Amino acid sequence: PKSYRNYSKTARNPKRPFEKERLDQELKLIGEYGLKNKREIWRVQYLLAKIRSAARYLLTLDEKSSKRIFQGEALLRRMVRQGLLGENEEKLDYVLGLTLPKLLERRLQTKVFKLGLAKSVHHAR
Amino acid sequence: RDGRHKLRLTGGKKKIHKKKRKYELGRPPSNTKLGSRQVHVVRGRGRNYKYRAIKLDSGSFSWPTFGISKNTRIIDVVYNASNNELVRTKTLVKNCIVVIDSHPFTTWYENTFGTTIGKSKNIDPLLLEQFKQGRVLACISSRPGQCGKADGYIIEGDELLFYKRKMDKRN
Amino acid sequence: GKGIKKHLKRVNAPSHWMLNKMGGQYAPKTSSGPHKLLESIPLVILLRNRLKYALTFDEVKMILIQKIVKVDNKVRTDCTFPVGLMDVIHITKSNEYFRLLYDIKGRFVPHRITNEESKYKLCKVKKILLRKGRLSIAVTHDGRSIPYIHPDVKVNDTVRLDLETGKVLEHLKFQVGSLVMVTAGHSVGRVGVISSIDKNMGTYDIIHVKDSRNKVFATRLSNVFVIGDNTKPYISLPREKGIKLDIIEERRNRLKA
RNA sequence: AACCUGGUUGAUCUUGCCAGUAGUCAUAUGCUUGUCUCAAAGAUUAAGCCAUGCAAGUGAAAGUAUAUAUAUAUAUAUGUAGAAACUGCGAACGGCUCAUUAAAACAGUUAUAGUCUACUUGACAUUUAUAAGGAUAACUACGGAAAAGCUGUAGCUAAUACUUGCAUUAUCCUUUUGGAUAAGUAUUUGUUAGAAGGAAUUAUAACAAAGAAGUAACACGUAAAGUGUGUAUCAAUCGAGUUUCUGACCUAUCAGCUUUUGAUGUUAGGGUAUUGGCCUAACAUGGCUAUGACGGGUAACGGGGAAUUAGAGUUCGAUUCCGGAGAGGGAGCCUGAGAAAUAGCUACCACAUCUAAGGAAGGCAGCAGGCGCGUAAAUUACCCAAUUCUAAAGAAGAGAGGUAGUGACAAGAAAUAACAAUGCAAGGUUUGUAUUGGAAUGGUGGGAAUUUAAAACCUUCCCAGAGUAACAAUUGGAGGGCAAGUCUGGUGCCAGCAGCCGCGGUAAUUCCAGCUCCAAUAGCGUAUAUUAAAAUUGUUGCAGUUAAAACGCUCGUAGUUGAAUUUCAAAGAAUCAUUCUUUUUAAAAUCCGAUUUUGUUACUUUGAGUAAAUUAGAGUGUUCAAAGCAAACAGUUAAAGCAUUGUGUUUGAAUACUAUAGCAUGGAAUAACAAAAUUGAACAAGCU
RNA sequence: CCGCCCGUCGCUCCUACCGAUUGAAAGAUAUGAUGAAUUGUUUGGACAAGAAAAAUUUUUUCUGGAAAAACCGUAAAUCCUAUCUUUUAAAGGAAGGAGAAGUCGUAACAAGGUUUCCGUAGGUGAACCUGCGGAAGGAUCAU
RNA sequence: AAUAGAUCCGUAACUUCGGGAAAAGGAUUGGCUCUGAGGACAUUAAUGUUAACUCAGAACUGAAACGGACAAGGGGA
RNA sequence: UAUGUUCGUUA
């Protein structure tokens, strides 16, 4: 009867809806990356929370544990593929250090504006 | 007709769902009388046939001390360990005690041993007294309502003495 | 009424069949026959999901109508026919011969084999029983009954049956040097030399098995299929050769390309 | 993200709740709504009631054809088919719903050495024969009834329908070979002998009695003998029924229940497919219970799972899968391998249809659809193309199922512009900023490719098609909590707002409006429920002098808890300065200076066996994402690999989890229990 | 302290309670009575086919057998009785709460003008008063 | 007038806990043929002789009737 | 150590 295909939510509402110091930071980010809504930054930080949660779980596992020395390089090679980590970053300790701007710099519109093509991030969008 | 509607182990009453299934079934008893051979056919689960014997008069009966079996006829029903109403109405059941014609056995003894494998069992007096009377006591060993025939074995020795004492410190 | 169920939902189908969730509501319920539904695949998924010859059930039926495919060198035309743990499939039109084996991930794969190879069948005897006249019959994992088996044959042995005649050729025992293939466990598909046979009175007897790389894995005795003696397996094995590699370092061979 | 804030006061610190806050695969509803993907949907209350129509049928070699039609060389032979009907199989699956149900069902874990099992698969059989019998459908003629899936009489005819019924093998011996001997499959009874299982009254074998059912009086044709159908038994398989251990919410203003009426057990039997008080007869007085029996409640089908989770938890699970139960309520029964079946039958109860009034026929909690109910839920659509099932099995069916329709239930992506020049502002000729004025692009319409069972959508291509881009974004707020006005009017303790604190009597930052601003945004409010917040249910982890709260006091059973004590170190190789690995050192039974077992459990470690969906998680650019389980690789037109002239090749669909209970397993610590003296051992010799 | 504040008595509304009425209703169990339908068994016995003779007819017999009946059993359903559960009527009685502003007094908070309070008993329009024994949460940490 | 004996079952409010109570209210009952249970007495673990009517159960039987006449509470609020 | 009551509601 019911369809078997999945569906999930990719964003979480922040709770505490009127933090001035959060609203200002998030508006700074919205404007400077030219994105349409704060739901988008919510998606990005939901993603980042997922990666951070996985990494934080891995750090509790001791080194040379099979689970850690499987999923750690799985996650690490995925991160370097996304480009969030460079050659100068190599361990599980640096995935914890990723931030919203370095996640947003991989969006298509920011990349194209940086590469030229468009003279503004809004023009790129 | 089986399994449910009883009280629990503790004595508590069990709420019932799951109305009666056919595989519980529970067919009515066969009160196998003693008389002319008539049997009926019961179709059990899997189309396996069960022969429900309404009346039998003869049967295969075994002399066990010699390990032989001969076909004789049942004369009367004289005891059963369950309800006495069964013997009073002369019904054949798996452990009923019946009176059996002795002549096929005595004739077989004449023919094989002479005179009135691993032979020469020396017999006993308590059984040949019945033989001289002509009618002998036997215990049914089959289930007439299940197989459709009454078969049994002559009782001798301590079990025979037991049953004779039970039938007849006594009246 | 409550007679036998005749449908199989896709998500209820065995996992090793690999039936996609979104591709229909039902799965092909294998007909009763030589092997259990759980430890066999139907011909529909043998010729539709593995060999990709057919694109649909009707095409599988079209294949089967022409008496082309044979299982144990006899024609089979039932779409839901159990193939089995190990047995030969012959596609005559395309001349090719398969044996159903387990890969180290416990999934039924058709191993390409040669015409000369396709006359030997390894049958794991499961019951030895004597019938009237003291004639001994061996019931095998395949489900065949082989009468007048050699008295030396025991319950957990294996026999090499000749497909065309159904006669035993030689039997193999279950010593601690005999190589075996695992049938249904976590370690389904591995091939190893039997470390030992831990027998416990009244419950499942466990047997420990050494891989080629001296890795020991234990299993229930019922999940074991003697494949050869200590010299070599009596069958060609799939490309993995029945060696299960750790997930951490299978990634290394995947990455190197 | 392991979080708090407003409110008791003149002010303060508490306790403590109220209120705020966020989520909900959680329902309803208000306002609003441009794209595409994706897809829940009459469960809540009424397992209430139903008009209509559909939902299970089936013949491609293989039972039965002078209904009948046709075709080939010459009235013949082969045919090709075939309405109807008999026969066979299926209709016991599927689909729906959740009323019942509280050790019941269900789950994990066993047993069936206590049983049944159609189709399918493998083995394989025993006490007129150049082919046996009647009798029936279809059909023909005559009818009855208002009506019905009603059927009377007479006459024919077959069948794989129904019923009878026609070689032979094995053993003993002189010993390829000759004579002699013997003949029941399951099942039942009696007396015996005895490949395996953990244990046999097992397999099997012998003797003595019975003895089913069968071993083809049947149909069509493949290698340059075959298949179909049917059949005894065994086995396998698809399953089922019982069954072991362990696991469930609230309630003691339910404390004693069960036992004539079977309650607990023994013995005998009946019944069953089998075990069993399942039932009967006799007998005994048992069985459960504060570790909660027996009751009551549940707005309770159980589980896989869902929401919320830092960790513990709390709440939910009618609903994709599994198991159960039901077909208005009960009960009964036929056929059948399988049903206590309900689009099967029989009856009662309640509803309810036709009737000529005599009588007939009914069961949507199947798919649509209607009424009712309610806060609360879609089309009387298209199709068997996929998935799969039934069949006499390619070819027919299937409201199973799929496709579309309705669809702001949820979920994902994502428009409502972007850009250049001058005025103006900031500043050392840099940013913001209304005028212009050209590019870009969808939304829209039309055609096409394509898609599809057909169609639609998606995708792609060609035409027009944006300046107030009128192709015009909303919802809810602006005293505090809590982001945002001491702006302008109106009302004037009214009307009204206000979750809470409060505002409103002429300066209303709070009502009714305008402007502005804030917040989230194709979404935003409201109600109820629930989670966190709540360390305000506290095991982790609360409090009890005075905020609520130590029984008046002591004894005391259950429960919970319980002192210390029984075998301790040294030596070596390896990272950096330490750490890390190996060996022995009592005693009793095995091995001729050396070879090897030494309570029970809890507990802990490893395993085994764990359905998927969901979850975690590996891989993979669905244009991204939700997803899905796929896919990737060279080829303006071929090399390569390999095949002895062609054959694509390389892959994935992993792992983890699956209680606490059960099986196996290493174990030194910590805990119990066992053994241990008003006495109990062992050894040697003699004796039995 | 021109502070705060208690209770009776009056008025209105809301909630719940007791209540004669052998109150009412709807369910659910249990016993009893009656008891449809039906399994099984027995009794039946419309007939439907065989076997004999007479050379169209008849007797007897063997099964198979339909109505119908009986008896055990499975047992719907209705009725009576009892018990329980849920809902609900009611003269009258008697609480509580909520009213912006009632009457009467002054009980408590200051030594609250008789210190307060507890248990218990009696009494009074009301708060309350009195007896006995306690407490300090007292107005005394004290010759 | 209504039963009314006996056996088995069931029995409320209230209560001075003794009662209420035969509460209320159900069922059964003849004859016949049987089955079971209940004692006393003597012999070398064992076998005979003999007695009361009292209960319980079952078949059958009849114009469904059976404390068959006699005898014998009406109950309840 | 004779008696000496009360202060309507809201802000």
Author numbering:
A (entry chain SE): 2 to 126
B (entry chain SL): 5 to 120, 162 to 213, 216 to 218
C (entry chain SF): 2 to 258
What does the paper say about this structure?
Building upon these important proof-of-principle studies in ideal systems, we use in situ cryo-ET to reveal the native translation elongation cycle and its perturbation by a species-specific translation inhibitor in a non-model organism of high medical importance: the malaria-causing parasite Plasmodium falciparum. As such, unlike the model organisms characterized in previous in situ cryo-ET studies, purified Pf80S ribosomes have not been extensively studied in vitro or in vivo and the molecular details of malarial translation remain largely unknown. Here, we present nine new native structures of the Pf80S ribosome, including eight active translation intermediate states, determined using in situ cryo-ET of P. falciparum-infected human erythrocytes, which elucidate the molecular details of the malarial translation elongation cycle. Our in situ cryo-ET reconstructions reveal an ensemble of translation intermediates sampled by the native Pf80S ribosome, deepening our understanding of translation elongation in eukaryotic pathogens.
As there are only two published cryo-electron microscopy (cryo-EM) structures of the Pf80S in active translation intermediate states, at moderate resolutions of 6.7 and 7.0 Å, we used single-particle cryo-EM to obtain in vitro structures from purified Pf80S ribosomes, yielding five distinct states at substantially higher overall resolutions of 2.4–2.8 Å. Our structures include three active translation intermediate structures, non-rotated Pf80S with P-site and E-site transfer RNAs (tRNAs), non-rotated Pf80S with A-site, P-site and E-site tRNAs, and rotated Pf80S with P-site16 and E-site tRNAs, as well as two off-pathway structures, non-rotated Pf80S with an E-site tRNA and rotated Pf80S with an E-site tRNA. a–c, Single-particle cryo-EM reconstructions, at 2.4–2.8-Å resolution, of the Pf80S ribosome in the POST state with P-site and E-site occupied, with the L1 stalk indicated (a), non-rotated PRE state with P-site, E-site and A-site occupied (b) and rotated PRE state with P-site and E-site occupied (c). Upon proper base pairing, either the E-site tRNA or PfeEF1ɑ dissociates, bringing the ribosome into the decoding-2 state (with tRNAs in the A-site and P-site tRNAs and PfeEF1ɑ still bound) or the non-rotated pre-translocation (non-rotated PRE) state (with tRNAs in the A-site, P-site and E-site and an unoccupied GTPase site), respectively. The presence of the decoding-2, rotated-1 PRE backrolled and non-rotated PRE states together in our parasites suggests that dissociation of the E-site tRNA may occur independently of A-site occupancy, explaining why the E-site is only partially occupied both during and after decoding. Furthermore, the dissociation of the E-site tRNA from the non-rotated PRE state alters the energy landscape of the ribosome such that rotation and possibly back-rolling of the small subunit are favored.
